[PDB]
Design an enzyme around this catalytic site. Structure first.
Site, short mmCIF file in Angstrom:
data_model
loop_
_atom_site.label_atom_id
_atom_site.label_comp_id
_atom_site.label_asym_id
_atom_site.label_seq_id
_atom_site.Cartn_x
_atom_site.Cartn_y
_atom_site.Cartn_z
N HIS A 138 0.64 -1.34 -0.10
CA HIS A 138 0.17 0.08 0.05
C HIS A 138 0.91 1.22 0.07
O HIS A 138 0.23 2.50 -0.17
CB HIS A 138 -1.21 -0.03 1.02
CG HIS A 138 -0.65 0.12 2.52
ND1 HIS A 138 -0.25 1.41 2.93
CD2 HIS A 138 -0.40 -0.56 3.46
CE1 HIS A 138 0.09 1.13 4.25
NE2 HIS A 138 0.05 -0.05 4.68
N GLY A 184 2.34 6.13 10.26
CA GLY A 184 3.75 6.00 10.08
C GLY A 184 4.21 4.85 10.78
O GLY A 184 5.57 4.27 10.07
N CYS A 234 3.23 1.60 9.76
CA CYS A 234 3.11 0.58 8.85
C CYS A 234 4.57 0.23 8.37
O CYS A 234 5.48 0.75 7.95
CB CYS A 234 2.51 0.99 7.37
SG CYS A 234 0.90 1.47 7.91
C1 LIG Z 1 -4.48 9.38 10.44
C2 LIG Z 1 -4.14 7.79 10.41
O1 LIG Z 1 -4.17 7.28 9.44
N1 LIG Z 1 -4.02 7.24 11.61
C3 LIG Z 1 -3.45 5.79 12.03
C4 LIG Z 1 -3.53 5.87 13.37
C5 LIG Z 1 -3.11 4.36 13.76
C6 LIG Z 1 -2.35 3.50 12.93
C7 LIG Z 1 -1.95 2.42 13.04
N2 LIG Z 1 -1.39 1.45 12.46
C8 LIG Z 1 -1.40 1.77 10.94
C9 LIG Z 1 -2.02 2.79 10.34
N3 LIG Z 1 -2.29 3.28 9.00
C10 LIG Z 1 -3.24 2.70 8.02
O2 LIG Z 1 -4.16 2.01 8.87
C11 LIG Z 1 -3.28 3.09 6.84
C12 LIG Z 1 -4.07 2.29 5.92
C13 LIG Z 1 -5.26 2.72 5.77
C14 LIG Z 1 -6.34 2.14 5.03
C15 LIG Z 1 -6.04 0.81 4.46
C16 LIG Z 1 -4.64 0.23 5.04
CL1 LIG Z 1 -4.24 -1.48 4.33
C17 LIG Z 1 -3.81 0.87 5.44
C18 LIG Z 1 -2.38 3.94 11.49
C19 LIG Z 1 -3.16 5.25 11.13
#
Ligand SMILES: CC(=O)Nc1ccc2cncc(NC(=O)Cc3cccc(Cl)c3)c2c1
Ligand SMILES: [Cl-]
Lengths: 305, 296
Positions: free
Chosen positions: A41, A143, A145
């Site tokens: 992603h 961040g 990820c």
């Molecule tokens: C503002 C924001 O995105 N907050 C957080 C908080 C906490 C987060 C903890 N882990 C990962 C994040 N990242 C994702 O979930 C990005 C993503 C979006 C949609 C699908 C996918 Cl496969 C990946 C976090 C993101």
């Protein structure tokens, strides 16, 4: 004496963490030999996440579109390929800090250490377990990820998890290092919800044996149970079924303390019925399920108090 | 989201761990530059030490034997001068921590790191660690930027299963001595400023059931807290919680009124951040760091 949620020393993994940038997205990568592994992603925008066609997004990319940073050095990308939900970036430099390693796929109930990273820089380490619903109750911010889960047995690092996303309930989902998700999750922004979670029964039993090893027996009783009767009661408290494999696995801890698995099952049954009555077990007022039988044998003494 | 007891990445400390053997005793040492620091009990310490030569101390770093060329004592720490400087020596400082402050522990056996965990220096100066025989010389540390601040070296286990040790200058934390005698940890208390920080971390993560409309005074809060074996809350503690109070909109004495109600009524079958007890091993700084993303 004492019992803590212990993580493996993270040094071997710290020397593999890199920062991967593709356009406006920046996340973490794992650099082993001349390959950098990261969530696919990274090639997506937020808009793309509703229905991403990864094969179509990737074909429009060249090697120089991926920026990889290891400390203060820029690594040059010379190839790229996708394997399930992981992007594999071939770089021109092999990691001189590559430890002895294996990629392993774990099962629910198994524990592992997580090295949480941001911008390719490690910030913390914690221990956790793969829940029965395939999620992990982690501590991750935006961040994180590409942060990885691992076990270190002997001098070999076994990578078992790569962080991909946070679900609406605050729990986390990710893949093994071959890019296969744990659970029915997709790297897509859809109505995805973690299934109802359950308690890891074999782990709670292991932790009760750890309490006995450390000198605490207030919770034992004079009863035994059949495996079927135990499971009929346990399922009423949202506990995972206990199988004959779980009973076999608890064998060594049963021999060390002199308490049969089914007698420990009877004590678990009574604990579920009565609660703790103001008491604690290994400094906890809840029944702990993120310590496997293997973790208990590793951490606790071989001599019961 | 999520809230875990998080330790600092241990790599910088792993590259300093060595095995020290003196006669029949084998324990852990910290190798920084050309000096190996370890508990002096590895050997009347002045009288025991004067009878030793450099070759009596065997130091092993991985599979390499280091040669001891000098030795001296500083309080309860033995400093062994070796012929090789540690090429993996990080930027470091020796710091003495106060009760309530937290740190990461890299537990070692035979000079080999086996685990890392986070803990706090209790008000009674003990640490509730997880250590077995052979763990002596294991170290506690924090990392601020790229500098490792060593704050603890493990020396012993007390009869209640808790642990005692020194700073890296050999000064014990607590009224403990390095010898076999009737030593007991004093009655412990709860680190109030840490419980409050963890209540703010719960609010940040979406847990507000314990919040109420009430506020209290510092004196009234301390009169109540003293009844439950909680450490007194000072104006410095209130000042330190300022940033977390501004982020959530809950004044410190507003959160004190919530804690007062949890102390007199309990949780009523509820949990806070997955816990049925009030957690005190997260400082206000740990909460800000884990809910911000500070890297090393
Ligand atoms: C503002 C924001 O995105 N907050 C957080 C908080 C906490 C987060 C903890 N882990 C990962 C994040 N990242 C994702 O979930 C990005 C993503 C979006 C949609 C699908 C996918 Cl496969 C990946 C976090 C993101
Ligand atoms: Cl497994």
């Amino acid at each position: 004496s004492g019992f803590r949620k212990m993580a493996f020393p993270s040094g071997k993994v710290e020397g593999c963490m890199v920062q991967v940038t593709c356009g406006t997205t920046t996340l973490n990568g794992l650099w082993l030999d001349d390959v950098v592994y990261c969530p696919r992603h990274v090639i997506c925008t937020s808009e793309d996440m509703l229905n991403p066609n990864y094969e179509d997004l990737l074909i429009r990319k060249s090697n120089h579109n991926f920026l990889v940073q290891a400390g203060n050095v820029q690594l040059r990308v010379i190839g790229h390929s996708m394997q399930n939900c992981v992007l594999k970036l071939k770089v021109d430099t092999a990691n001189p800090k590559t430890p002895k390693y294996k990629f392993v796929r774990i099962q629910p109930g198994q524990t592992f250490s997580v090295l949480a990273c941001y911008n390719g820089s490690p910030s913390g380490v914690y221990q956790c377990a793969m829940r029965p619903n395939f999620t992990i109750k982690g501590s991750f911010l935006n961040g994180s990820c590409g942060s990885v889960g691992f076990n270190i047995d002997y001098d070999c690092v076994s990578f078992c998890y790569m962080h991909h996303m946070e679900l609406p309930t605050g729990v986390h989902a990710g893949t093994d290092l071959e890019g296969n998700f744990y659970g029915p999750f997709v790297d897509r922004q859809t109505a995805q919800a973690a299934g109802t979670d359950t308690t890891i029964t074999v782990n709670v039993l292991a932790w009760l044996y750890a309490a006995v090893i450390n000198g605490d027996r207030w919770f034992l009783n004079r009863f035994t149970t059949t495996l079927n009767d135990f499971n009929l009661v346990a399922m009423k408290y949202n506990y995972e079924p206990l199988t004959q494999d779980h009973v076999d696995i608890l064998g060594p801890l049963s021999a060390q303390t002199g308490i049969a698995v089914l007698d420990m099952c009877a004590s678990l049954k009574e604990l579920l019925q009565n609660g703790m009555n103001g008491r604690t077990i290994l400094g906890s007022a809840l029944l702990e399920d993120e310590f496997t039988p293997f973790d208990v044998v590793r951490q606790c003494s071989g001599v019961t108090f």
